Nucleic acid binder design. Sequence first.
RNA 1: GGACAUAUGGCUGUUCGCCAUU
RNA 2: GGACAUAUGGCUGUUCGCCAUU
Lengths: 457, 456
Amino acid sequence: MTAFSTLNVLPPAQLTNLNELGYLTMTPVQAAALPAILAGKDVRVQAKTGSGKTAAFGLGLLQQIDASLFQTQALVLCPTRELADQVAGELRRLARFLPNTKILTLCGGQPFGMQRDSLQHAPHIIVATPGRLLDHLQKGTVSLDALNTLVMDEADRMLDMGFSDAIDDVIRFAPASRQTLLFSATWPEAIAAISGRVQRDPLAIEIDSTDALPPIEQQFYETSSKGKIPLLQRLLSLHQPSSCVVFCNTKKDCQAVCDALNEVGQSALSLHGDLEQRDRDQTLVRFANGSARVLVATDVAARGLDIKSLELVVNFELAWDPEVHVHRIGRTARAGNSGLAISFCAPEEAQRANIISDMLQIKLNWQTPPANSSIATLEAEMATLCIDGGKKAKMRPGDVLGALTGDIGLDGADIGKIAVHPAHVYVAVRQAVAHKAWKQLQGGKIKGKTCRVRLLK
Amino acid sequence: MTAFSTLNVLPPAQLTNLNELGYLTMTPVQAAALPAILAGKDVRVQAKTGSGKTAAFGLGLLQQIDASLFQTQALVLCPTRELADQVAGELRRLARFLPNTKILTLCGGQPFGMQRDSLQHAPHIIVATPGRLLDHLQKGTVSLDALNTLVMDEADRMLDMGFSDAIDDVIRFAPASRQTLLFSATWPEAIAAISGRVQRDPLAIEIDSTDALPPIEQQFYETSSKGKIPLLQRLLSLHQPSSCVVFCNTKKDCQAVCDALNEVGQSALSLHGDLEQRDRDQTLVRFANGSARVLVATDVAARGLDIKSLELVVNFELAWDPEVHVHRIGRTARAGNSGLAISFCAPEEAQRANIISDMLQIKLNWQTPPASSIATLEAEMATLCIDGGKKAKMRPGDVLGALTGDIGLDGADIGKIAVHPAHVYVAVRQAVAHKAWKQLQGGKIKGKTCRVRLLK
RNA sequence: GGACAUAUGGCUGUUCGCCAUU
RNA sequence: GGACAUAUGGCUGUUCGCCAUU
Ligand SMILES: Nc1ncnc2c1ncn2[C@@H]1O[C@H](COP(=O)(O)OP(=O)(O)O)[C@@H](O)[C@H]1O
Ligand SMILES: Nc1ncnc2c1ncn2[C@@H]1O[C@H](COP(=O)(O)OP(=O)(O)O)[C@@H](O)[C@H]1O
Ligand code: BEF
Ligand code: BEF
Ligand SMILES: [Mg+2]
Ligand SMILES: [Mg+2]
């Protein structure tokens, strides 16, 4: 029985949904912010990473959704496409209590035409990045006239110098009589002081100070820039993390580190803005489901990404801003878990390490370099099958699991994460059984119908 | 220089284009119909199958294309989606003489929004099936206001009872002052009499009578309906055709025969209207490049499809109309080749065999069934599907360059390369297919990384 | 018969389905 | 720096590019 019932607002169908979903206890940010949000107040919330802010504003805006009114009623803004799809994915699971709730994602990298076609049936909720959404607004394919709530996730990033104009351009399409929710784990005083420009009489709910991190152990290594890649390979050999995210400050360094890790057999993929959007999506799928051991990324992955039970974060180079460092290490130690965050520091980056030390009021644990120089390989335990169809073909996870376990004859313990995307379904299978599964499912049948299956790298 | 120079009309760049393409001699329909078309006249043409009608109307409409004018100036209508894409494929090859010529296909099975997106830059030429084109016309995403030429390939099918309404609906968007070209190998007089409704004082160029077939040998077998599938398996085991098209009259029989052929190990794919369009496209790709030995199809493949050096056509059931029989067997013996067409005849279908006998002025060569065991038919190739296509600026040379250079493949192990709008299909011999797929998966084409799937 | 065509979404992790109207 | 964004096409089967204006 869920503790969310103590709010005395949510309908019984939502309480049953939360019980089936496993939301049995409210996190602090949920307990502190949901009553005000459900009452229609504007809020600015500050809570640490991985503490459930998504459901905090998601349960809030869902309470004011009328499924019979086929117009857009809630809008969520995110700084990155992968985060936007993730937030929309969790909103959909929270919206199960309300049948026929259409939640649409509007991001770049997708062709404009398919979004225009989907927008003829106006979605109740839009989760979007500012760029593609503004395009749709200017061409009259999206209307905000029926907007009840506007949410800005990672709101200090959405209000910075880079996003302010695009955010301002979007808000002129929004009604003034709206609930505006701003959520983030970090709030620079400059950004927080001006944050009222997009709100009406907001309540400040600052339950975690900026130095109140999740349980993250931090280690720091002195190294020249030239020694970073050899050090990283040796540290990954020492810790042997089940999953690891390595952060770089440039797209060039990001791809270079990924290629260096794959050259020594340490299963790595890259995630940055010069990749094709399909590769960005498939890389995140394969890293999350265990088809890759290490993810090398720029700050496109610094915020909000919720990779389950991430063991290790490595700062190949310290971020330009200390707030970004907080978001990076926040990729681990989520939802009550602990984590380890290693940071490399060249002499030019010493001052950024000092700024992080002051802001977080932590003592840097400088480590002595490893005793062994041996570089071991890291093989990924899973491989990803990509089946054509997705939600358009009404292929649900039970169909994939049923087909894989039946005539194709696989053990249910050999199948990991199943992710249903709009046009594809991704399945994780143990590496040893992946090739047989691919060939047998290619000439088999799923849901009575024939399928097209790909085996990803 | 190519004999096309004797037309004294084509620009020099097109004469060079024809020589590089291998069009060194004009076919009869090209030699007989192109002067009138290049002079701007409406024509109704009757020429046998596989004798070059596409270039006949393709060179015609391209002569009146203004590349600086970014409006639709030529429209080609086809009865099937695969034929429309095929006709556009050869039009692009013929349009190399004119840089920056946009030829777009408008067919069903493709998402509407992506087509709307492409239509912001209006294409010079549209090749389309009537259904999806009319949708675009009614929604104002396509304009025929600047149309110079209108082509109806397989014009006798486009003017029949099933298409008449939609064709009229399309023509309502076209100018009356237009060149209208009608091509087909078959012309029922009833359809030919009403064909003038869409033309302006047309020239009739009927160089092949309906019985003037390409060199196609025909054999006929008496058989029960129950004995058809075992006979087919035995005939394919005897003949071992490198490629074969088996025609059925229903979508159910089409899939049933395909599955029975695969049960005895005779590499077969199916092509019919109940398939997803992606399956239809990939089936035609894999059959055309040798990744399957037998193609089982309904009459969706009866007309216009140009499969190179197709060895055998089998009529599992005789078509309802004799003209469709002409188009079916016309899938073989193309562009000067010979071919074999076997037909099965159940007692209920004897009447259809006689009608074919009269129309084609042939005496039926009835065969006695094979003395015979059922053998396997292995596909010699496998198809790699690379993501990108023309959207990613991938030209066939890039794929071949990556396969032969870094990945280290023999150039003689790579067959047909087909650049589609979003994908590139490559045929490689099955013995090397898995190695090619895996190494191209972790390799790079054109400097950039690729994501490669193996269809099989 | 065969073509042409066939909107947009919601729904249990052992499939072959069940719903909504835009 | 990193996000957001990044139109539509043409180019001769041994790639890593070259062009057009919408
Ligand atoms: N009340 C809850 N009970 C159990 N799990 C939760 C609860 N709220 C959130 N979670 C899960 O914990 C993780 C926290 O994710 P997220 O909301 O992205 O944190 P934040 O946005 O604050 O960084 C998510 O995987 C979410 O599904
Ligand atoms: N003048 C020519 N010289 C050589 N080959 C040609 C010539 N014209 C056409 N071809 C080829 O011959 C085949 C005839 O195809 P197609 O035009 O579809 O015939 P039809 O439309 O008359 O059935 C095609 O593969 C085409 O590329
Ligand atoms: F702060 Be959470 F990681 F969005
Ligand atoms: F008449 Be051809 F086969 F198009
Ligand atoms: Mg979040
Ligand atoms: Mg033709």
